Amino acid sequence: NPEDVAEHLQERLEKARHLLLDAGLPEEVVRRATETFLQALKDDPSDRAVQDAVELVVGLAEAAGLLIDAGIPASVVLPLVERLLLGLADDPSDHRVRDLAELVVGLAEAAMLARAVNIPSAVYVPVVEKVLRALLADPENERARRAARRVVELVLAAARLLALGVPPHAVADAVSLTFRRMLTDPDA
Amino acid sequence: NPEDVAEHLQERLEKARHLLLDAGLPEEVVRRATETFLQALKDDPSDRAVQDAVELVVGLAEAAGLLIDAGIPASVVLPLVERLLLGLADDPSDHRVRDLAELVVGLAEAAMLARAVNIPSAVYVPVVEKVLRALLADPENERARRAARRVVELVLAAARLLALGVPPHAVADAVSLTFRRMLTDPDA
Amino acid sequence: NPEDVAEHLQERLEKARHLLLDAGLPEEVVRRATETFLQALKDDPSDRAVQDAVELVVGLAEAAGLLIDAGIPASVVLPLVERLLLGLADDPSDHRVRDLAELVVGLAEAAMLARAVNIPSAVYVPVVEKVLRALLADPENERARRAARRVVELVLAAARLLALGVPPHAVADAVSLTFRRMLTDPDA
Amino acid sequence: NPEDVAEHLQERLEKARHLLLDAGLPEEVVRRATETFLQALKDDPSDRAVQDAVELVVGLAEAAGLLIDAGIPASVVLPLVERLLLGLADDPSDHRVRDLAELVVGLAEAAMLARAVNIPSAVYVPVVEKVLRALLADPENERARRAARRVVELVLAAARLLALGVPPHAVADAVSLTFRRMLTDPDA
Amino acid sequence: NPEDVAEHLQERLEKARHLLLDAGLPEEVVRRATETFLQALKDDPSDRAVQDAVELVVGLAEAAGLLIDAGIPASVVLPLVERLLLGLADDPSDHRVRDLAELVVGLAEAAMLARAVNIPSAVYVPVVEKVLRALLADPENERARRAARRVVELVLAAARLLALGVPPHAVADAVSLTFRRMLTDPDA
Amino acid sequence: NPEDVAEHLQERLEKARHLLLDAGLPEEVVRRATETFLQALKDDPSDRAVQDAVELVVGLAEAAGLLIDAGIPASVVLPLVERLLLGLADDPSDHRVRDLAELVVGLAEAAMLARAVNIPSAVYVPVVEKVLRALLADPENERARRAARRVVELVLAAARLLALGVPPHAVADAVSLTFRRMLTDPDA
Ligand SMILES: [Zn+2]
Ligand SMILES: [Zn+2]
Ligand SMILES: [Zn+2]
Ligand SMILES: [Zn+2]
Ligand SMILES: [Zn+2]
Ligand SMILES: [Zn+2]
Ligand SMILES: [Zn+2]
Ligand SMILES: [Zn+2]
Ligand SMILES: [Zn+2]
Ligand SMILES: [Zn+2]
Ligand SMILES: [Zn+2]
Ligand SMILES: [Zn+2]
């Protein structure tokens, strides 16, 4: 129910504020964004756009911590998460900002799944770092968005290869070669 | 349960709309097809044909994005996906249309798996482009369907070679040679 | 778990029925065999012989399509698959019938892998055609079974040569010479 | 309601005292912490920090038992839980102590979920043992906290792989390889 | 209120006597235990130990019926419940006896919840049978108590995996694998 | 993981039993060896010697079939495989028996690769027949072991010549001459 989802999203928003504060974001930005989203939920709980924006905010709060723990420096994750949070707070129905937020959440999920499929950190951390740096440079750059989507597709293809019956070692070797090639060649 | 599957398919159908809207398809066609399928699910949730058609529609929605990201131009993917969507909307139990939709989804999956196997893009993108152009020319052409099925079988054979113990580099070399020959000669 | 494997096998059996109908088998034979196997699974899910027979049936359903797409005429594949399906349906624990079914599945897998190894179709399709014709002539002929097993071993030896470090072109040339000689001389 | 939550937390605190006594902690420490927290709840039921501290105390009481049952020796779990209990009792609003308690509760949950995922005990018990030993050595060590968070993320990624459609056996194999590498190298 | 709890426990004790008589326990033992507990409640209603013992007795009365219906033979449940009832009647404040009674009640609840999460009976009934046989052999055996606690934790981890978003089929498959391994290997 | 390897080796041992029964070995010997090895795996899964012996047994099970298909009579292969199986079953850590089993598996692999290299059967079958007859005569004869190792090295040198760039026909001619010389003179 829209009111029930609103209450659950307020709880998850408090948790997201805690996670963002622990990650390293400034207190003022987190406070402003969380207050704006909480007020938006309180005034119109039935609003779908606010609910989707809050879901994306919680996803980003988790993703920032996952990406910082993975190895990507906090000098490229924190500014990107700050800009995404501000953009979501301003216009909760700005399509490009939501697309970028889901791109970052998918990148964090792919980075956490590449470890599970036993891909070394030294081959996949550089690629995610490059993609995040390119996204931080110009948010509207289509090539960086394509690269992020291709990294997610590579991790999903590794999962599909595992499902097909290939031993985990062969899958890890092949996808590590693919990541090494993607480090230099864009269309690889 | 048929009603539970209907609800899950409604959610996946909404997600498939966005992705189709994101890909570049016209808004009117996507709206028409999605509304028709949602109404079909709502009236008769237990209908198996509608459920299979919705599954194929979601698969095509993901496949269009994967194929466009791979490198195949949107001038050959979008018309084909539009035709398949319209055919599925009209008759959700037209066997040839479902076969073609499954062929396109399998081609997208094969193109995504060829990257994980570390096959260069310049040798497999032309082959998928040619196959999709032949399919767009005449949907009932048996040679194009056979070529698509053979591409999928080649990717699966590369996976089987990886499982047999061949190093990934040798597998990539052999399958790249096979793709190069398939570019020129049909039965290659 | 035997019941879980049984349920998965019913799903794969429906898929196998679809594939066999697509291949060109008569509807009546496919319906009879599939209903018999489904009933056998439902009555005694824990039965190992029924599960093995259903696995062989799914393998044969895939193998028929692979062999028809490869180039072998449907006048030698469809009768053989029909006879194997009927034999499996009658006695799911007839050792010779299961051996022949695994021989056909292995022949299809070898034909699929010879393309990845980059062996031309014109050298390996005639040999598989001859082996399948000999098998269709007399199922109990030991020479035809030996020839099928030797074709599978030749493709596996090509994979082993690829693994040893021989370049793919040299492997293709040597195994093509071997296939050319196997066309004429039996112990080649 | 704050008073209702206070009553429920008093009941759970009695249960947690029983669990801690059964685990092997000294009677005096458990008694001291429990009476301090009960008095804090009684004087100011509406206090949020006391409620969060009591929730963490109950979580730790269950976590100690789960970790001891899993195989981790009581010589590394009991001192850590004792220190965490004393720290929570002293300052119920010390951010680092709550973070460490949440890390230990998450480690216990990950250890209990790795068994359900069907991960062998000999590959994950050593890693949790090493992480807990590092945490007991220096509580403020960031590397140990990062390692605990990475173990939790690995278990969650295994769950995500199960949700994607990979068979449980392949998931177990891949995540077991990841655990084996994490045993030796820190960023694995 | 202690007197109100005493009255409610007298009613539940009559119900528990009915359930124990239905299960198959001898009339004399049930009569003796119920009369002793009823007299203890009547003389000192405010006594906490008697109330806890009566609660455990009602739990055991339900647990015996649940375990017998589950499939575990009455030759291993009835002697264990008889010994537990006699021990509770003799000293209602014997810590080990209450711990064993709670272990049996938790085992019954785990066996009841394993069916809800769709785990086949043939994989979990043998494990509970083995645990109960080991407990009947030597009540003070720590390995059997650890095994019972681990079975309860496995069912709770299955519930947590359901809560995380894994489909019920994958959860059932993974926990069934875990149960099959627990059948042989004690630390599985 | 040792338990995972034990389970995989149990499955491969069942497959090896099937292959050995198909080859022509007596049922009693195959059953005895297989049950002994299965029990050894079950009691101590972590044992390395048992795992190596099971791997050698599977290799021998495949090698017997390959050698019989190649043309070598079953009167010299089946007794040798029987003796090797019994020796491995008795002491799974007897160095000489493992060396002889590895020699036979290598001879089968060399005979399989000599066909791919396109060496006629009439020049290499007699040499393998003579080597296997000498090995069956006296297992500890060093000359027969040296001859088997030299056959394997000749096939590997043919593969190396193919890798160097020599045309396959010249390689086949040179190695056929070498095999003809080896037929008569021992150090040829
Ligand atoms: Zn709610
Ligand atoms: Zn549902
Ligand atoms: Zn979008
Ligand atoms: Zn299942
Ligand atoms: Zn079809
Ligand atoms: Zn209440
Ligand atoms: Zn914190
Ligand atoms: Zn009352
Ligand atoms: Zn009754
Ligand atoms: Zn206790
Ligand atoms: Zn495994
Ligand atoms: Zn057989």
Would you give the distance in Å from CA E143 to the centre of its chain? 17
Q: Measured on CA atoms in the order B57, B63, B64, B66, is the torsion positive or negative?
A: positive
Reading the block at residue A3, the tokens are: 């009111």
Let me know the angle formed at the C-alpha of A24 by A18 and A28, rounded to the nearest 5 degrees. Answer: 70
- DSSP-derived secondary structure letter, F100: H
Reading the block at residue B69, the tokens are: 């990201």
Q: Does residue A163 belong to the interface with chain D, where contact is any CB pair within 8 Å?
A: yes
CA distances in angstroms from C163 to A94, B171, C106, F160, listed in the order given: 53, 9, 20, 12
Reading the block at residue B21, the tokens are: 């809207």
Cα–Cα dist F77/F133, whole Å:
9
Q: Does residue D186 belong to the interface with chain F, where contact is any CB pair within 8 Å?
A: no
Q: Does residue E187 belong to the interface with chain F, where contact is any CB pair within 8 Å?
A: no
Contacts for E90 with CB less than 8 Å, ≥ 6 apart: none
Chains interfacing with E (3 or more CB pairs < 8 Å): C, D, F
Q: Does residue F184 belong to the interface with chain D, where contact is any CB pair within 8 Å?
A: no
**For every residue of chain A, which 3-state class applies, written as one string?**
CHHHHHHHHHHHHHHHHHHHHHHCCCHHHHHHHHHHHHHHHHHCCCCHHHHHHHHHHHHHHHHHHHHHHHCCCHHHHHHHHHHHHHHHHHCCCCHHHHHHHHHHHHHHHHHHHHHHCCCCHHHHHHHHHHHHHHHHHCCCCHHHHHHHHHHHHHHHHHHHHHHHCCCHHHHHHHHHHHHHHHHHCCCC
Judge contact between F96 and F140, C-beta under 8 A: yes
Q: How many CB atoms lie within 10 A of CB E138?
A: 10
Cα–Cα dist F156/F173, whole Å:
15
Cα–Cα dist A67/F77, whole Å:
60
Distance E163 CA to ligand 1 centre (A): 14
Per-residue b or e along E157-171, where b marks 16 or more CB atoms closer than 10 Å to that residue's CB: bbbbbbeeebeeebb
Let me know the angle formed at the C-alpha of B168 by B162 and B174, rounded to the nearest 5 degrees. Answer: 85
DSSP string, D92-123: TT-HHHHHHHHHHHHHHHHHHHHHHTT--HHH
Type of residue found at D49: A
Nearest to B41 by CA among B65, B22, B16: B16
Nearest to C70 by CA among C21, C131, C17, C129: C129
Judge contact between C20 and C64, C-beta under 8 A: yes
Cα–Cα dist F61/A48, whole Å:
64
- DSSP-derived secondary structure letter, F171: H
Would you give the distance in Å from CA C77 to the centre of its chain? 10
Q: Does residue F115 belong to the interface with chain C, where contact is any CB pair within 8 Å?
A: yes
Nearest to D174 by CA among A112, A121, A168: A168
Distance A149 CA to ligand 3 centre (A): 12
Residue with tokens 């050792």: C95
CA distances in angstroms from C35 to C2, D159, F56, listed in the order given: 19, 37, 42
Nearest to B103 by CA among B173, B152, B55: B152
Cα–Cα dist C28/C86, whole Å:
11
Judge contact between B145 and B103, C-beta under 8 A: yes
Residue with tokens 């289509």: A142
Counted residue by residue, chain A has a size of: 188
Closest Cβ–Cβ partner in E161, E173, E188 for D113: E161
Long-range contacts of C99-104 (CB under 8 A, 24+ apart): C99/C145, C99/F22, C100/C135, C100/C139, C100/C145, C101/C56, C101/C59, C101/C60, C102/C56, C102/C59, C103/C135, C103/C145, C103/C148, C103/C149, C104/C60, C104/C63, C104/C80, C104/C132, C104/C135, C104/C148
Q: Does residue E185 belong to the interface with chain F, where contact is any CB pair within 8 Å?
A: yes
Contacts for F111 with CB less than 8 Å, ≥ 6 apart: F66, F67, F70, F72, F124, F125, F128
Q: Does residue F174 belong to the interface with chain C, where contact is any CB pair within 8 Å?
A: no
To the nearest whole Å, the CA of F127 is away from the closest chain C CA by: 16
Cα–Cα dist D114/D129, whole Å:
14
Cα–Cα dist E105/F146, whole Å:
69
Q: How many CB atoms lie within 10 A of CB B11?
A: 10
CA distances in angstroms from A160 to A145, C20, C161, E177, listed in the order given: 22, 25, 27, 22
Using a CB-CB cut-off of 8 Å, the residues of chain F touching D120 are 1, 3-4
Number of H helices, E strands in chain B: 8, 0
- DSSP-derived secondary structure letter, E162: H
- DSSP-derived secondary structure letter, D166: -
Reading the block at residue C54, the tokens are: 């259903």
Cα–Cα dist F16/F21, whole Å:
8
Reading the block at residue B103, the tokens are: 């062929």
First to last CA, chain E: 45
Helix F121-137 and helix F95-116: axis angle, to 10°? 170
Q: Is D162 exposed, middle or buried (0-12, 13-18, 19+ CB in 10 A)?
A: buried
Reading the block at residue F158, the tokens are: 């043919």
Cα–Cα dist C179/F37, whole Å:
39
Would you give the distance in Å from CA B174 to the centre of its chain? 25
Nearest to C11 by CA among C19, C46, C25: C19
Cα–Cα dist A18/A52, whole Å:
20
To the nearest whole Å, the CA of C140 is away from the closest chain B CA by: 30
Long-range contacts of B59-62 (CB under 8 A, 24+ apart): B59/B101, B59/B102, B59/B105, B60/B16, B60/B84, B60/B85, B60/B101, B60/B104, B60/B105, B61/B15, B61/B16, B61/B17, B61/B19, B61/B20, B61/B23, B62/B16, B62/B19, B62/B105, B62/B108
Let me know the angle formed at the C-alpha of F99 by F96 and F101, rounded to the nearest 5 degrees. Answer: 110
Contacts for D122 with CB less than 8 Å, ≥ 6 apart: F1
Cα–Cα dist B34/F112, whole Å:
57
Let me know the angle formed at the C-alpha of F103 by F101 and F104, rounded to the nearest 5 degrees. Answer: 65
Q: Does residue D66 belong to the interface with chain E, where contact is any CB pair within 8 Å?
A: yes
Long-range contacts of F154-157 (CB under 8 A, 24+ apart): F154/F110, F154/F178, F154/F179, F154/F182, F155/F110, F155/F113, F155/F114, F155/F117, F156/C164, F156/F110
Chains interfacing with D (3 or more CB pairs < 8 Å): A, E, F
Closest Cβ–Cβ partner in A146, A161, A173 for B69: A146
Reading the block at residue C76, the tokens are: 């030698």
Q: How many CB atoms lie within 10 A of CB F169?
A: 12
Chain A, chain D: beta-carbon pairs less than 8 Å apart: 63
H-helix or E-strand containing F181?
helix F168-184
Among chain D residues, the shortest Cα distance to A171 is held by: D174
Reading the block at residue E27, the tokens are: 């009339």
Q: How many CB atoms lie within 10 A of CB F15?
A: 13
Distance E109 CA to ligand 3 centre (A): 47
Q: Measured on CA atoms in the order E145, E147, E148, E149, is the torsion positive or negative?
A: positive
Q: How many CB atoms lie within 10 A of CB A11?
A: 10
Q: Does residue E121 belong to the interface with chain C, where contact is any CB pair within 8 Å?
A: no
To the nearest whole Å, the CA of A22 is away from the closest chain B CA by: 32
Q: How many CB atoms lie within 10 A of CB F118?
A: 24
Residue with tokens 């002994």: F36
Closest Cβ–Cβ partner in A65, A113, A118 for D177: A118
- DSSP-derived secondary structure letter, D165: T
Q: How many CB atoms lie within 10 A of CB D8?
A: 12
Q: Resolution to 1 decimal, in Å?
A: 2.9
Nearest to B179 by CA among B133, B121, B136: B121
Q: How many CB atoms lie within 10 A of CB E21?
A: 15
Would you give the distance in Å from CA A23 to the centre of its chain? 14
Nearest to D161 by CA among C47, C30, A163: A163
Residue with tokens 């052409």: B141
- DSSP-derived secondary structure letter, F1: -
Residue with tokens 């909480």: A38
Chain C, chain F: beta-carbon pairs less than 8 Å apart: 62
Type of residue found at C173: D
Chain D, chain F: beta-carbon pairs less than 8 Å apart: 9
Three-class secondary structure of residue F71 per DSSP: coil
Cα–Cα dist A76/A65, whole Å:
13
Nearest to D152 by CA among A112, E162, E166: A112
Nearest to B111 by CA among B161, B72, B160: B72
Judge contact between A72 and A125, C-beta under 8 A: yes
F168–C174: do the CB atoms touch at under 8 Å? yes
To the nearest whole Å, the CA of E176 is away from the closest chain C CA by: 8
Per-residue b or e along C87-115, where b marks 16 or more CB atoms closer than 10 Å to that residue's CB: bbbeebeeeebbebbbbbbbbbbbbbbbb
To the nearest whole Å, the CA of E122 is away from the closest chain D CA by: 18
Judge contact between C22 and C65, C-beta under 8 A: yes
Judge contact between E160 and E167, C-beta under 8 A: no
Distance A12 CA to ligand 1 centre (A): 13
Cα–Cα dist C142/C135, whole Å:
9
Q: Measured on CA atoms in the order C34, C36, C38, C40, is the torsion positive or negative?
A: negative
Cα–Cα dist A69/A115, whole Å:
12
Cα–Cα dist D160/C174, whole Å:
46
**For every residue of A35-65, which 3-state class applies, written as one string?**
HHHHHHHHHCCCCHHHHHHHHHHHHHHHHHH
Closest Cβ–Cβ partner in D109, D163, D171 for E165: D163
A181–B118: do the CB atoms touch at under 8 Å? yes
H-helix or E-strand containing B171?
helix B168-184
Cα–Cα dist B137/B66, whole Å:
21
Cα–Cα dist F180/F188, whole Å:
9
Cα–Cα dist F58/F11, whole Å:
10
Judge contact between A63 and A105, C-beta under 8 A: yes
Counted residue by residue, chain B has a size of: 188
Cα–Cα dist B113/B124, whole Å:
11
Reading the block at residue E144, the tokens are: 């059997």
DSSP string, chain C: -HHHHHHHHHHHHHHHHHHHHHHT--HHHHHHHHHHHHHHHHH-TT-HHHHHHHHHHHHHHHHHHHHHHHT--HHHHHHHHHHHHHHHHH-TT-HHHHHHHHHHHHHHHHHHHHHHTT--HHHHHHHHHHHHHHHHH-TT-HHHHHHHHHHHHHHHHHHHHHHHT--HHHHHHHHHHHHHHHHH-TT-
Cα–Cα dist F31/F9, whole Å:
16
Q: Does residue F3 belong to the interface with chain E, where contact is any CB pair within 8 Å?
A: yes
